[PDB]
Request: fold
Amino acid sequence: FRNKKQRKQQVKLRKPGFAVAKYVRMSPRKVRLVVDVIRGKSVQDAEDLLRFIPRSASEPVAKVLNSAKANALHNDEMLEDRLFVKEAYVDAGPTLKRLIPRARGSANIIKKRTSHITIIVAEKGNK
Amino acid sequence: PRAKTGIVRRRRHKKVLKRAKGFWGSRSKQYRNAFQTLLNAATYEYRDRRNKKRDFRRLWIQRINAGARLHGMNYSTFINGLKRANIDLNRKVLADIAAREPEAFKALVDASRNARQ
Amino acid sequence: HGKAGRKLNRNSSARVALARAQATALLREGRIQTTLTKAKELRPFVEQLITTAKGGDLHSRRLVAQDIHDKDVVRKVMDEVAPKYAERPGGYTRILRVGTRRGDGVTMALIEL
Amino acid sequence: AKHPVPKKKTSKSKRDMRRSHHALTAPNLTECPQCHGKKLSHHICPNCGYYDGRQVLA
RNA sequence: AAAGGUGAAAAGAACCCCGGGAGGGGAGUGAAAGAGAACCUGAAACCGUGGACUUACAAGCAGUCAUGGCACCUUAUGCG
RNA sequence: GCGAGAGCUAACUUCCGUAGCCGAGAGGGAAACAACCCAGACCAUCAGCUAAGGUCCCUAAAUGAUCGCUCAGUGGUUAA
RNA sequence: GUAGGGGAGCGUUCAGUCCGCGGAGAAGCCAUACCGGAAGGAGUGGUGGAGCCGACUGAAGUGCGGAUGCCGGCAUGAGUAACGAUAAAAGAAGUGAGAAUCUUCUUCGCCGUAAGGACAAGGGUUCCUGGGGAAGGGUCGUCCGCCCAGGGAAAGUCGG
Ligand SMILES: CC[C@H]1OC(=O)[C@H](C)[C@@H](OC(=O)N2C=CC[C@@H]2c2ccc(NC(C)=O)cc2)[C@H](C)[C@@H](O[C@@H]2O[C@H](C)C[C@H](N(C)C)[C@H]2O)[C@](C)(OC)C[C@@H](C)C(=O)[C@H](C)[C@H]2NC(=O)O[C@@]21C
Ligand SMILES: [Mg+2]
Ligand SMILES: [Mg+2]
Reply:
């Protein structure tokens, strides 16, 4: 094993079949709805469903899935016909705050929330 | 010099927060409510310490005239006999005998009936 | 309750203009892509114009001219299309559903003769 | 001011409980007979443009 | 008004992949990229994903004490 | 509570005297209940005796013993 | 045992003295069933990546749950109210990664003592061209009064 210092140079820390769309200008809540259908499904169903879910979050999500697919293949040399959505989740990016005017002189703050859409693909393996 | 809070508060806060283990909602998550919950728990802790001491005697008394009645007696009566037969000072664990050893419990019922009549 | 029968998502004046506009477009083009509902509503009105034109006399033309304000379209419907549908026991106009649009998420459709 | 107003913040539980019915329903996608790229029932296949024969361009 | 901090040194990431881009994954640099330019540590509120035990006859300052059921053994098997 | 005035020999009224408790008093009892009854908590026990109160079942402990009374649910709304 | 009086101490920063520790891993953070009569204090592991416990004495900007307290971050209400005049719109063709929304054609409708046109005040490059597409645009933009670059403004007689 040695000590931490050595471990850091010996083992270099990998992200197999992981992709992330950081700072996506959409609300987590809203984006989650789409991701929620795609989770657990086989990367091909995931691909096909996304093309028909009539939500604008579909485009962002679908893109992450293709990055996760490409990464799984090209970088990690995984088997395409075995890929499935092992994990997908939407985490909250930083909020774009904006000042909206209301009646009688008072102001308000619009929260233009952002998303961190991460999807991780893996090979199935029943056996 | 300037003596800032830094560390003192957080340590004290995390302490209270850790007493709140399986407390519902905010009670296990926000300090003010966690600490607040514990004051009421304090009342409960001190009370129940001497309250369990009433609880068990009652469970024991219950198992006693349950057996005493099984042999045609009762608690008031059975304990009076065991008092009259001075020799018997059992009192504590007289319910284990009633629960686990019926044969042995009868012996005590029989002995109580005598010292009384 | 509400057991009537027709549609109107605008006001009298407009509901007419729309029907007449889409009627002129389908007859000009032969096929038009529109909202599914606007297409469902257009179907009976254009089918009715074909039957009027199937008369082939001045009165039948002028009646078409009341809803078809484009002179060239009225000639097309009168002398080209109605004749072709002579033996068709008035049915032709069909609706095909394309799928959901981006901006409003509305399912588009086709209406062809 | 703003006449009826909420009396207490609604708990993390309560809030999520009303969310039980928000879960989207995935399309019932069918395999296309003549280009196989999935389509919606009663709709023209987006890939080949068929609906028995080819109806739309591309 | 508010705002500080890569790395010892810019060696500031050539090249490849998904993407219009953003963003990411690799390759390489470096002691470390568990430092990548929204660059020291990175608490807490607050948002999620996963697992354990659980919950659709129940009246609830949300604990406390008692007991039973399940589960886990890194101040940790008499006990927790 | 007792002793008085004010008050209607009203008020969870007011104002003195006097004793106690609450205030600043937890614990048992009185269904619940500052004050009334019992009793003044240094800490630990899965020991024992009592107080006021209790002993059908909810709910600890006699569905006790003797002689009586009351049949109205009186007990479990006051008077001429 | 409330006001209150008295006693013994825990903890933080700074200082002086002693004893040490640290890149073979400091502080800080995170987890923990250990210890002490309390404030509290250790052991172990994890993270961090350069400082720092312990003891004695000295000094304080020295301990927070409250103040409709101050600063900041983030929740609830809730995917709710709204999206700023009820003067419309339709289709075709084009462009583009992407089009209800940009361009073009044909209709439609609304103003017409105006919702047309020319000044003054005021504004300050918003003008034209080519390009952009993060934010601004109550939606989307391939477009814009936005972003970048270049250009344009000509007086003896007009106004001073
Ligand atoms: C329109 C909006 C504005 O509210 C207002 O003006 C409405 C009409 C007022 O209502 C009233 O007066 N009435 C409502 C019920 C009775 C009373 C009333 C009484 C008599 C008459 N008589 C006739 C015959 O006509 C009319 C009305 C409001 C509600 C006022 O509150 C009332 O105050 C009373 C003193 C005590 C009342 N309670 C507590 C018993 C309380 O309800 C007041 C003072 O605002 C005036 C509050 C403060 C907060 C503001 O100033 C806000 C910010 C306003 N400022 C702003 O711009 O928004 C507002 C909300
Ligand atoms: Mg009388
Ligand atoms: Mg506060």
User: Anything to note?
Assistant: The first strand of chain C starts at residue 31 and ends at 35. Chain C has one domain: 1-113. The domain at 1-113 of chain C is CATH 3.90.1030.10 (50s Ribosomal Protein L17; Chain: A,).
